[PDB]
Amino acid sequence: SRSELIVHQR
């Protein structure tokens, strides 16, 4: 579930 996390951190 990094996909939702990465978008923010990205």
> Could you give the CA distance from residue 6 to residue 1 in angstroms, rounded to a whole number?
9
Locate tokens 């990205």: which residue?
10
> Could you give the CA distance from residue 9 to residue 1 in angstroms, rounded to a whole number?
13
> Could you give the CA distance from residue 7 to residue 5 in angstroms, rounded to a whole number?
6
> Could you give the CA distance from residue 8 to residue 1 in angstroms, rounded to a whole number?
12
CA atoms within 13 A on the CB side of 6: 3
Structure tokens at 7: 């978008």
Helices (H) and strands (E) in the chain, counts: 1, 0
**CA-based diameter of the chain, in Å?**
14
Which technique? NMR
